[PDB]
Amino acid sequence: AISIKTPEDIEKMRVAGRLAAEVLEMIEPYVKPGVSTGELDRICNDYIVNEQHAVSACLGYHGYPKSVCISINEVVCHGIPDDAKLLKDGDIVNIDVTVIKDGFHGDTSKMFIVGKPTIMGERLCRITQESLYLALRMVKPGINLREIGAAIQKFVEAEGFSVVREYCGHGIGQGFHEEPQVLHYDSRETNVVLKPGMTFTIEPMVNAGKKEIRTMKDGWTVKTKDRSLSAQYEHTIVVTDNGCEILTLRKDDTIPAIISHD
Ligand SMILES: *C[C@H]1CCc2ccc(OC)cc2C1=O
Ligand SMILES: [Co+2]
Ligand SMILES: [Co+2]
Ligand SMILES: [Co+2]
């Protein structure tokens, strides 16, 4: 079943979600042409462990060897930090962080555009963030997840892009990936009504081309089948009595942390 978090659990998820957001805030000035993805991962890991006094949920998870996932251009998700892989002008890069603090998880990702942006990279990243935000604005008690996944898909396809169908958002708490699955597209299979105290992620992945993806031979890296660009943003939220509260908000977000309906 889906766990309802207690008020004390929610306070612990505020703290873990803030730490995760803070990793994304911190790492920004380091993202520039010529830096390696391995070095970015080391900086993040060292900050989580030594500064935040927390740990990466990603390190060792099902054997994963690094602390964050770093996904460039046509890599959709789960890109593996590599000391040999250097960023360059125009690259779009997702950094996905999940921190554990006091046994609670905070999970968030954002795109960075490296150096001189390309038109396509700027547009894809903006539409992706807007897809997340439109979903965030819908969350409240009594709505069905289906409606949220439908709204993301409608908006994205109207902008000429496609929604990746795997790798959905998820419940989160003391576990990293809990129920429910949070699909970012319309499915007749989806039927989950929200209630206050649920905690879950929304994390749409949007491809500039077609939706299909492929897992590479390293067993982790996922790429677009068509080699088009792919972008993603993620937040962790808690459902409140009248809306939701974003637990991984950053200073650069332009949506309020607390979304109230009435
Ligand atoms: C932490 C990061 C490692 C890579 C990976 C692969 C598959 C998966 O499925 C839920 C999650 C992850 C990660 O979260
Ligand atoms: Co300290
Ligand atoms: Co997630
Ligand atoms: Co994540």
Ligand code: NA
């Ligand atoms: Na990408």
